[PDB]
Design a protein around this nucleic acid. Sequence first.
RNA 1: AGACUCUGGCAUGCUAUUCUUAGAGGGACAAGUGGCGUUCAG
Lengths: 81, 52, 32, 738
Amino acid sequence: RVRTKTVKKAARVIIEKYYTRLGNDFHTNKRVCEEIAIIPSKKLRNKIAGYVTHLMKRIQRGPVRGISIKLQEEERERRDN
Amino acid sequence: RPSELSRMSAAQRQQLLEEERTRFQELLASPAYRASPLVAIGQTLARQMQLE
Amino acid sequence: VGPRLSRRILQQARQQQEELEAERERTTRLGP
Amino acid sequence: ARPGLSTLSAELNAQIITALYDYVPSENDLQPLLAWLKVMEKAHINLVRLQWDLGLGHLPRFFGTAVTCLLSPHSQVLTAATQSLKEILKECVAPHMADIGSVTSSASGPAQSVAKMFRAVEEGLTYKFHAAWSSVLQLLCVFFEACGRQAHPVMRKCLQSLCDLRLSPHFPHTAALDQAVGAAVTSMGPEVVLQAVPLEIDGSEETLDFPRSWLLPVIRDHVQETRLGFFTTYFLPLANTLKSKAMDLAQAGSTVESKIYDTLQWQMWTLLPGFCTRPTDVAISFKGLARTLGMAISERPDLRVTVCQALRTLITKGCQAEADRAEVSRFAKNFLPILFNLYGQPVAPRRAVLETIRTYLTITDTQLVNSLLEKASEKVLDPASSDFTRLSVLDLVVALAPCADEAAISKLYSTIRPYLESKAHGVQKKAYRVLEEVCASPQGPGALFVQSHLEDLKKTLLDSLRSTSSPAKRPRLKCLLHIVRKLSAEHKEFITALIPEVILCTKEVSVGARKNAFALLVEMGHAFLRFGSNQEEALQCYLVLIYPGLVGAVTMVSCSILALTHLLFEFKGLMGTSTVEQLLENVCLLLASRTRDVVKSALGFIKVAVTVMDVAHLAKHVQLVMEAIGKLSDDMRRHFRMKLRNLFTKFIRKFGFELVKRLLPEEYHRVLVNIRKAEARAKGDSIEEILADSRQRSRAWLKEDEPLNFLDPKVAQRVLATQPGGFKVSADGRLIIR
RNA sequence: AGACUCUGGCAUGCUAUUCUUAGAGGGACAAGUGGCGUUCAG
């Protein structure tokens, strides 16, 4: 199967918003997405968790500077509110 | 008994197999299924369609 | 600076270097 | 043409190339300049082939102009130049590198030429190019790959200078520059690389943005031919200190630095699969890493998937020689009791563990396989074990199976033989799985078991037919797969008693056993080609044994056509083409039945029949096939719309166009002309780059701080090659997605 | 040669319930392994 654009658009917003709180496996971020987005369809929650898990398997292999500054700004919006 | 095999239980599939075992062993040794194999099968679907 | 101005600067800066390094008939026969 | 010594002498070419240096036409005419450096490629490659050590003598002057001529504003100059330079290096330098040996900065002979090779290309890295940098980096990549091992004492200047390029604010060739350093690490090895460019992640730092973090992804994907002793003495002291540092800041309440320092240490446990590709010192340094890996797999859940992947690299491609095989096998007594604990521990990456198990027994001794087989069998037969623990060690039986001797396997088979009639499907599946895998070994003690219990397995697989569940079929077929391949001629009683199940297995609940069933029916035929001299009538014996499945119940008549569909795809001409049309004629009668299952397999037959059976013999049956298709039904046409529309496409391409309209009824006429319409119709890993919503190359941006100096060695940092510079939220704050 | 809609396999879980029921809750997502792969889609 191919991935629908509504899954992919929902995929990108979660990672840039709540990166710190999620993990690396499918089972971990299935728990998280239940607690972060309402996701009225169960099949959507199934698809959104895996494609988040697929990116998180990839983003971990990259250089950590892109991670490091993103953690810098994540708390920066977090401590302000 | 449903028509497709995905709907009945796993137990119900087994007597489908064991009745199938009987139906070949009575028919492979049948006198008609030694001369014209294709004709007998075609004639069997000929009467089966005619009844239904 | 931008693409158009920098293209002229790099080409001009190269040519000033060459006239610092700067300060016959071609060899028709090959065997002496 | 590369002429011989009588046609062209070696000393003649030196005079030619030195003469041709006086033309170099201007810089940018592109018509002879491509041809000019094409022959200087061709003259040099010929001069090297005749006398090689003189060949390195003339190389530096050509590479003087070749680096210089990269500045020409024509693109086709740039592509042809590096294509010339790469073919010199792949052919004139790479095989002859070993005779040169290691080169220092003070070489004298032909190695001094290699010093001038690299000193030329380093001049190709500064600010003056700024548009050839994608082309120069390709040149360095091959140049690193061929000469990196024997020229590492001179190459330390570029690796600094390659490092300072990536500090540019916007480098479009970040993807390419990693490829240059990555290949360089492959030949030189990270210990040399890290001396020229030191990592500054050596524990404690004042900042948090580590400017040289890109090295660690580079090293992971490219290290394959380095001694393993470097990883023990360098990274593990840094691995433990960073891990200790992050937990210290974890309890301090700050979750940002600890999350950074955790992410750093996890990335530098991923180097070990790289470091264990082809070690040169695995015979002596593997003793230094057994116990630390043993601790790091037991009490570290995060590193489990790394280490279990890491071992699989070491066994498969780091165990070529027999001397390296001993110490891994010498440590098998330690890792199995650890790895057995992790798999059976109640809840986790179990399947990551099981694949590591399957590899690790393939290299170990057989007596310890036998010993743990006894102990695992004790856990199975123990009634004081939970069902989860029972099924957990049952997989461990399957892994332990093929490496045992003939004696232990026969004891194991006697143990498992009463289990095949179990009502618990999980136990029955593992029970057939044991009998499957012991036949899967084509050689060794497992192959000996095949003819030993040959009657015993045959009766066991037949009396266990009546209590076989639906999920248990998939190992049963694979069990049947491996014994038909070694079955003798006096076993037709087994094969003919095996047909009604496997044809019924073609339409069972799973898809896994279906492809197992399709593959077996192929070799069931290959069983019958070996049982007769005249091949066609043997396979005619094969098909007449399955024809009575065409007459019976709606489940089996749809089953039988599916098998006949797959048989004709593989034994195309072995049937005898005269046999085909009657089978097509019977399925035409089958096409009229109201049940949708039979017409599902009937249309699939007609789809494959036209491909296999020849057009002239199909021409004799054009009328008969679509006479039934026309008068099927309204809904049956409406349901199977494109499947009928597909078989319409097959005829009109292969046959005449007008012929089908005369035989079809009215409704299919407007459908068919849509198909004539169709046949006329036919006539890179940073956060920003991965989260993407998905003349021209000569543009440079000067930057203007301290005033710009073009004669500064670090001026290439301050020139650039590219451009500088939604859902609804609930009252709870949770996102709303639709 | 349906990348349309919906839906099934097994529940010794809930409801008046292991064997007959009919409402709901689980589960399955190419999920995982290895090859062919533009190494990302397949």
